[PDB]
Subunit: 509 residues, 4 copies
């Protein structure tokens, strides 16, 4: 009955998955907690079983991870980079079967699932060179015979808590950067993506073991909210990188702050696209479609608000409706499929209430709005007109493919409206006006961490830092100097002279 | 009876201070809150009075500041830097008399009063060049016809809460850096240094108004915990830089995180000096003395733990005694005075309490330990030997000049003892050994934000970033790229090409 | 008969100038070369005299600067920045009178002459903060127990050769940066701006002396080609920064190369403005006018080629013409004057000769062309239409206010036409097309060092690096990491571990 | 009779090598020039043949690389990095055979041949991440409505001329970096390592072909001096990276400077190790030997001068004689050999002349000095004592394993003696003294590009920039921000507003 027992999914064994899999890795495999069965969201069938971490399994893994950091922190960064280079190779070798699992257990289409593995591969290749670059400047001291040096050192144990929607890429950014920076990692993923977590962990575990490194450098404790809470409350977890809901993340932030820990928070988005009157509509319509319906509207960067200038509102909405009607729906791993299921049945329920709540706040469904009558967690991609930009349902983040559309007239109000929500992840304007683009990029422009021009809200690459402002939680991942979040800075002054001159010219005798 | 009314203290008027001073500034001066009188700790006499912020004053000040920000954010950063350059010059012209006020109301000696003002002068000169510099890389996008740029923009309103012990320098770092970064500022100082806040604000306000700029760019609301708590809970304060105790820092951190604000935390220190058997003892002894007794032991970077290798312990303690006994004690504004009073009478009592608790836990007062028999808040700089490095009184930061001295034997144990406490601000070892030095700077070395070699734990320069790890709160100020904390990063992709994404089967 | 002896020019004494001035400074003032007279190009009247450097003067000055470097290089860079801050202040207090000297001896209008002093002031402000920042990274070694750090150290003696047209700003970018970088400087300016060189040097000398530093840190040796050639051949000149013609800089570049020195060459320009059909013409015409006739067209960044899309070629030419006929000509120090004289009498012959050659090559003079019938080296600002874009006269750099106007149709060809010249200094396009702008900035866009959009080719700011490509020599001055050209990089690996090398079979 | 025709060398065919090979690659393979046979320095047996480039081949190849550049420079940098990554993989896969060919044709030991290829693999992995990072800052303009951006674009065609000794690593450093930076490459290697060039080029071509990229992106034209001179004078070669002798490099710099090109010069070294009295002799003796005898003393980083403090000179020399006696000499593929032959018989004759000259100049040969009695270019590693530190032969860079030993007493003189030679590549001190070490790294320390502590003069890592000062030519390769030499900077100002404010506030 389990998909992994059927001959058509024999490919799952290419990842080393079996019937029932150990969900805890710390150099050894195990798991004394509850056994969980994950399901294919396209057809509600069970895939395989994962043994979750008990509290004793969590405890022993933290201790072994900390034992392993002592070895790992002594490995020169570029040699740590070499390990990350081999992780990238191992991922590359299995990119098609691993992306296939992502489509199967999580539900995004195959191009996006292989693309998610490619991000992990790409951030590995990026971290290899960065492992020869991380550090600070040597600075000119004002004091004779003194050296002034900025040093960076690992923070220790990096806990990484991931959500269902990027069960691979988010861990990848975190793991590749944390590791070249000399940290050990502990991973607790979403329970509905446990097999993905195990399959990735197996890939990394073999690379550590092939290099005779302690496996707990990249530990795994599959589990639910109690393992996540324990990590937030645990003083041995020096940095906690949490990706998830704003609601749960706020509590994670408070528990880490209570113990003077470090948190890296990637929380909810309520991302706006703005199309001005001079916008290229050949760019607006398909950009908005991909950004809205891509991954069935379940990215943190999904376009959820569409502001259109008064003069072109109707035309964009009509053209958007024409294009929605051609979205090809089916199993996420079949060719030509563009749109698959939601990840859980609860997500369908949240979708339905969102749509009803938008009707009750005076919105009009111009496209979609219904559960699709088919096996799996499938809902129609939905467009809502007529809500005021300050409608409660438009300010709520709903992880479902609902696009609230608004009119506007001038730039100043619509910039404000982009900025008025609690979230602050991604944002995008479509315009040709040079002055407006640099204003959008300026202090009176977009307040988000991602600020795009003539591309949708899901336009990001690993070269820059990834994260948001306000209720998105402030953290950054991937590129630029985001590695500094995974290390502690020391300002170091070395008197190599025989004298003791004091800063700011203070004479003390 | 008020010091400001006696002719020998007429110089306070050079700072614009009067008998009763307004404690709120937001373009205009006011203060409808509680009136307090601050006192000179060298003689327990009242100096002058400050009318503090009421709630309505606070409300009006935040509103005015956020309005001023709309103007200030539109000023090009280099021109903002020119304003900060004039603030530099305006502190330069007042450095002697402002430093005397710091000596009079806070109580540190004159060279440290002027040196603290010199730090604000220094960070101003630094920020002027930085104002032509702040920003991010243009990065190579992986997409044809796309630009990738990292932009930095101001967070808006920077609230600044400071403590009594560095009533000028801390605000100075935060103010100069926040200003060039395009933010407006709201300052709440320690009530016992309210005259210092007012005088500093007067200097800034004049520069602002001389440049026909709204003075709320650098607002002041004098007040106690109610004002500080209001700032920590106020969503209009985008960044709260808080320097203070660890207990209150933790509550401010939680309040800011509750509202998804930004906090910058600079909390307590329990800093250690370690002296290895190979150390130049002529660097060790005066470094320890200055780091210990400087500012009467009231810096967050004060050395409170002295680890000496077993082989040189007694000689170093004996040499430190001989040096403690030669310290010149007096009024802190008198030149050539080296040792002033504690900031309050409570601190004198808390000093005696810790000496007693030290003795109870088995320590020996080898020097000092007693209040001095003179007017003011004077206690003897104290050296305790014989405690275990884990004794509880030595793990509780007490703003009093008590230096706890421990023995050690080997590198590894004393590195761990340095790291064992809750705080993580400054640290220093004294050694000639090349490998030990780099290990101290490495991942198995010191865990503090300031990691020093052959100098005391105190007296950092402004070119590097300042702050601590662990219970010190993790914030940074002053140098390096600490400015990034005062701004918001954005990663910006610009599609400048006429290319449409693949139709992916949809007829458009 | 000297202007400095007339009552109205008595303001010259505020700069310490006299009838005859020493043109050598190395801590002492001297000069045993030929005495030269400088003339005011506004009326061809002699201003005053300067004694130039003999061979002996040059030798003694180099030795003294090389001795001063021993002291200066040991001064911490942030303290070297404090000196530069004071130079900036000394220039601030003299900006009106020094700018007036620039107008009187060089001949640009007063706002540009003051604005040129401003640039030196600005780069000082910048350099102060830069003196806290310069350095390189500490990198992770792949070797256990090893440090990898990039050190920067001064090159030693920076020869600075400048031209007549920016007799203050160019020296200042070089000076403020070389100084904070730990170098000593030797200046040889243009002979016809000797008083400016002497006056700048007096301002800097006072600061140095006031700070009890050897004056040779900023040495001056006024002289002609013999001194400049000596510097290019002198192994004691570790870096030679040369701003001048392409023909001379090429020989300077080879002489420095022949002795394995470092050189920084800022040579000619042939800068183009390209206005596309969608350009804001209210931006195009005033931008073109300023860039072409500002400084009487004697800037290295002056616009000399103006490409206009054939749809708007005549309209732009007509509006530009009516705009030319409204320029206020007169004495450059008189108010509201926007167009002063050429710098030399010889420059007027080159202008007349270029105009005829332009007519010779088929171009039509649609405005100007003639010498103005008045005292001084006054020529009419000129506009020439009808040349092929590749006319020989339009590819030669001529320091005259002649604008060569061309038509174009396609973006590809006109980008190529911008790039086809030998020089690669400045360039500007005027358009609203987002894609064309980023293509202009990209690998198939401008090949110049300054690449502008909707602003003239002249008037950069200090935050960025300044300089050109191709026959402009490749040097960079002022901003970004231009400072690195004044320092030598070292890549330093420190073994601090007691680990011994792999014996590899040998018994040690 | 050719080694590639013998069964024991059949591994050569795994590199695509045949009896007669084409020495030109530009997308197609060819070679109309002279046919050269390269020989094995271990036994003077012919390996294979290569058809060198005619001038027509060079001419055709430049045109193809320039056309290929139009395509390559349009490809985003991170995608260019993806090519380089595959090149590292294709090298990684062939490391043993390519290492073995390096040992066979050049003559170094197999572990060093393999290690030289690892450097290329390493710089590939480094450049891949660099491909997402290159660029400049976005700076805050002093002007409202204005953007300030620093851009970097490729230079175009980067000609790479290498010498025999690092026939793979140097090319790789220049190639990986120039490629991610959007340039195309044309390689002329040393004729005596033509097979190495063809083999490396075959490996790269396959990667380019599989990625459907024009092969001329990595062009090769095997040839002698006439081809190198062509590149030095060729305006279409935008950057010429030249590794080789100072004599030729000086001429290369002059030719490139004459045409206003860009040159990157990596010339000779006369590197010193200094062992102070406090040095760990357990570190000094092996570090000296491997730095002096490694690669038969044919590195540019080879230790040629050993300064020893008087107190320890005799001991170190005696321990270094007893260590030289254990160097295992044999064929460079023989397992467990440390020391192979010199590259040419002319290197043998230079060696002999240097020894005899050192003897005729007063030195004593305490070890070696003679040619070995076996087939190949084998000479005893040599140690010369009693020679004054400025003896003429000591300052001559002779590319052979001779180590000149000198005594010293004081830190200052021996630093001066390190710095007194014309070359400025690598330098090393062995000491435990902390103050001495930072002085060595400071402005009065080593003048070299590479400044090491307690490690030998060779063996730096790709993370840092590599190159020297003075007569070493100033170029930097590989790490840090060396990539900037392969790109042109542009300072770009964008006015996105309808206003036009001039810099420095100049009102026109
Ligand atoms: N510049 C001073 C600042 C101390 C600040 C503090 O004690 O809270 C120092 O480095 O000790």
């Amino acid at each position: 009955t389990l998909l992994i027992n059927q001959p058509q999914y024999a490919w799952l064994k290419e990842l080393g998955l079996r019937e029932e899999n150990e969900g805890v890795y710390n150099g050894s495999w195990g798991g004394r907690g509850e056994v969980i069965t994950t399901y294919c969201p396209a057809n509600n069938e069970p895939i395989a079983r994962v043994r979750q971490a008990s509290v004793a399994d969590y405890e022993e893994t933290v201790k072994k991870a900390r034992e392993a950091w002592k070895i790992w922190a002594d490995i020169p960064a570029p040699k740590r980079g070499e390990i990350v280079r081999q992780i990238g190779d191992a991922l590359r070798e299995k990119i098609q079967v691993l992306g296939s699992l992502v489509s199967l257990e999580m539900g995004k289409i195959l191009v996006e699932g292989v693309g998610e593995v490619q991000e992990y591969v790409d951030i590995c290749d990026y971290a290899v060179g960065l492992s020869r670059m991380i550090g600070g400047p040597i600075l000119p001291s004002e004091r004779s015979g003194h050296a002034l040096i900025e040093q960076w050192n690992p923070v220790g144990l990096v806990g990484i808590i991931t959500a269902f929607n990027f069960s691979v890429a988010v861990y990848g950014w975190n793991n590749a950067i944390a590791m070249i920076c000399g940290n050990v990692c502990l991973w607790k993923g979403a329970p509905t993506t446990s097999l993905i977590s195990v399959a990735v962990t197996k890939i990394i575990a073999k690379v550590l073991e092939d290099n005779k490194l302690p496996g707990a450098i990249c530990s795994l404790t599959c589990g639910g909210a109690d393992i996540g809470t324990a990590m937030a409350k645990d003083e041995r977890v020096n940095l906690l990188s949490f990706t998830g809901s704003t609601q749960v993340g706020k509590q994670v932030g408070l528990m880490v702050q209570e113990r003077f820990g470090r948190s890296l928070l990637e929380l909810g988005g309520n991302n706006a696209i703005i199309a001005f009157e001079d916008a290229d509509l050949s760019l607006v319509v398909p950009s908005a479609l991909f950004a809205a319906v891509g991954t069935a509207g379940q990215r943190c960067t999904t376009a959820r608000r569409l502001f259109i200038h008064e003069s072109i509102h109707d035309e964009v909405v009509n053209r958007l409706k024409k294009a929605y009607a051609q979205i090809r729906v089916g199993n996420p791993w079949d060719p030509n499929v563009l749109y698959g299921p939601l990840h859980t049945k609860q997500a369908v329920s949240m979708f339905l209430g969102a749509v009803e709540e938008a009707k009750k706040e005076g919105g009009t469904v111009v496209y979609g709005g219904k559960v699709m009558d088919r096996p799996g967690n499938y809902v129609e991609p939905t467009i809502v007109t007529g809500l005021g930009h300050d409608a409660s349902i438009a300010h709520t983040e709903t992880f479902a493919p609902i696009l609230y559309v608004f009119k506007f007239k001038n730039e100043e109000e619509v910039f404000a409206w982009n900025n008025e929500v609690k979230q602050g992840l991604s944002s995008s304007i479509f315009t040709k006006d040079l002055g407006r683009i640099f204003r959008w990029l300026g202090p009176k422009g977009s307040d988000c961490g991602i600020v795009n021009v003539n591309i949708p809200t899901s336009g990001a690459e690993i070269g820059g830092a990834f994260g948001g402002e306000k209720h998105t939680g402030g953290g950054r991942e991937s590129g630029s100097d985001a590695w500094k979040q995974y290390m502690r800075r020391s300002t170091c002054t070395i008197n190599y002279s025989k004298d003791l001159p004091l800063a700011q010219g203070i004479k003390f005798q």
